[PDB]
Amino acid sequence: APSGPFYRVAGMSYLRYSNICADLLRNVLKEPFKAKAQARQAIHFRQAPYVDGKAGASKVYELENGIPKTAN
Amino acid sequence: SDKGLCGGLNSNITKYTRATLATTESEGKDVVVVSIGDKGRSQLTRIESQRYQ
Amino acid sequence: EAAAPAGPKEFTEVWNKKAPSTLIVPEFPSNYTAVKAVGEGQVHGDAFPVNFYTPHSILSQAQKDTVVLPGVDGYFGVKASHVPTIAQLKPGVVELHSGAESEKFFVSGGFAFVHPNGVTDICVLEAATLDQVDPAAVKSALAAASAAQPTDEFEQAANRAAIELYSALESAVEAKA
Question: Which superkingdom heads the taxonomic lineage of this protein's source (chain B) (predicted)?
Answer without folding.
Answer: Eukaryota
